[PDB]
Nucleic acid binder design. Structure first.
Ligand SMILES: Nc1ccn([C@H]2C[C@H](O)[C@@H](COP(=O)(O)OP(=O)(O)[C@H](F)P(=O)(O)O)O2)c(=O)n1
Ligand SMILES: Nc1ccn([C@H]2C[C@H](O)[C@@H](COP(=O)(O)O)O2)c(=O)n1
Ligand SMILES: [Cl-]
Ligand SMILES: [Mg+2]
Ligand SMILES: [Mg+2]
Ligand code: NA
Ligand code: NA
Ligand code: NA
Length: 326
DNA sequence: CCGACGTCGCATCAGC
DNA sequence: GCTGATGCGA
DNA sequence: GTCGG
């Protein structure tokens, strides 16, 4: 990438603001600037050149000038030296430990991997599984493995009820050569925006995937969202595959296009597109696009019969999934 | 200057 | 138990 | 931290 040094610096700052400062809007600001610089097709020569991009303001322009001149950022060099920031940043790398819990753990003297394993009974269920698979969850998934996983999920879902449709979204649907996890959108004609004519629709799919030993652990689970752990089968004498994060989201079948737009992302693309919708007088979630009144209360859902219909309402040219990796 | 910043599912906890 | 924040996550 | 009214 042309500007990897700058974008890494801004990402590290984003993570600091989220994990340590607990400033979600600074986290989003830094990530938005990193994303716009990542797609800028020139090697940036100055902060002023970067400040022309939307999301890069005066402060980041100054950091870019320091980074270009020296190859580092004194603000980050100091953060890297702060023991509390180091501890908190490490603990938040466990799934289920966020900024609040990380700081509480540090207060209580729990700040290393050894400390965590020593104190499993101080972890909730999600955190306990996140610790169990700490190393695995930072490994990436080759697309070749994503395809094997897709095959298992799609075939097992079909065995439960041929009327299900499972769609792998996330970075996979954007065509990435590797993914951080597997995101599965699920629909069934019995579950629409108008009625739920059959119970346990998500449950019976999860159960089937547990039965064939694909799903191995559960982080959380409700009627429409599963968050868990899965693993490909290995062959005789083969080293096992890493355990992987899996998210499954059951979406009302008639709202598939809003659902698949949401679950395809990226997360920054969704923030950007939804923010553009609001400026255009609309609000978009994973179910609907609705107008806003002069009051600012959402109106009735608008007819959507393609992903492109959603782009049309907000006066955006259509962007294929591969062009949404912001 | 300064209010807004995307939107929502599940787990957990506090107040009643 | 319910309801509404809050945390953490997609 | 940045943007737009
Ligand atoms: N804050 C978020 C996080 C996720 N999402 C949506 C968009 C994501 O593309 C989708 C899956 O979340 P994810 O964290 O797995 O993101 P991916 O796009 O799949 C990443 F590229 P990765 O391949 O590392 O999972 O949920 C979102 O809307 N807002
Ligand atoms: N998980 C899914 C995927 C597609 N669909 C529907 C939405 C459209 O009517 C149609 C689109 O087919 P496809 O996008 O797979 O080419 O399938 C669904 O109901 N659930
Ligand atoms: Cl809605
Ligand atoms: Mg993903
Ligand atoms: Mg704005
Ligand atoms: Na700018
Ligand atoms: Na975490
Ligand atoms: Na995911």
């Amino acid at each position: 990438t042309l500007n990897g040094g700058i974008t890494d610096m801004l990402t590290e700052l984003a993570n600091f603001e989220k994990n340590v400062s607990q400033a979600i809007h600074k986290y989003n600001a830094y990530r938005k600037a990193a994303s716009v610089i990542a797609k800028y097709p020139h090697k940036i020569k100055s902060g002023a050149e970067a400040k022309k991009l939307p999301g890069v303001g005066t402060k980041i322009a100054e950091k870019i000038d320091e980074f270009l001149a020296t190859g580092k950022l004194r603000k980050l060099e100091k953060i890297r030296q702060d023991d509390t920031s180091s501890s908190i940043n490490f603990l938040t790398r466990v799934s289920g430990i966020g900024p609040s819990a990380a700081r509480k753990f540090v207060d209580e003297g729990i700040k290393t991997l050894e400390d965590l394993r020593k104190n499993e009974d101080k972890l909730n269920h999600h955190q306990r599984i996140g610790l169990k698979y700490f190393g695995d969850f930072e490994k990436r998934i080759p697309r070749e493995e994503m395809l094997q996983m897709q095959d298992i999920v799609l075939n097992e879902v079909k065995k439960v009820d041929s009327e299900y449709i499972a769609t792998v979204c996330g970075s996979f649907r954007r065509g990435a050569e590797s993914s951080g996890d597997m995101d599965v959108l699920l629909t069934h004609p019995s579950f629409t925006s108008e009625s739920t004519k059959q119970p346990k629709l998500l449950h019976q799919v999860v159960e089937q995937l547990q039965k064939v030993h694909f799903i191995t652990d559960t982080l959380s689970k409700g009627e429409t969202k599963f968050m868990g752990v899965c693993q490909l089968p290995s062959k005789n004498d083969e080293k096992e595959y890493p355990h992987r994060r899996i998210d499954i989201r059951l979406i009302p079948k008639d709202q598939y296009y809003c659902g698949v737009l949401y679950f395809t992302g990226s997360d920054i693309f969704n923030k950007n597109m939804r923010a553009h919708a609001l400026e255009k007088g609309f609000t978009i979630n994973e179910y609907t696009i609705r107008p806003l009144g002069v009051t600012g209360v959402a109106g009735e859902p608008l007819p959507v019969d393609s992903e492109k219909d959603i782009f049309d309402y907000i006066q955006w040219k259509y962007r294929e999934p591969k062009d949404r990796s912001e």
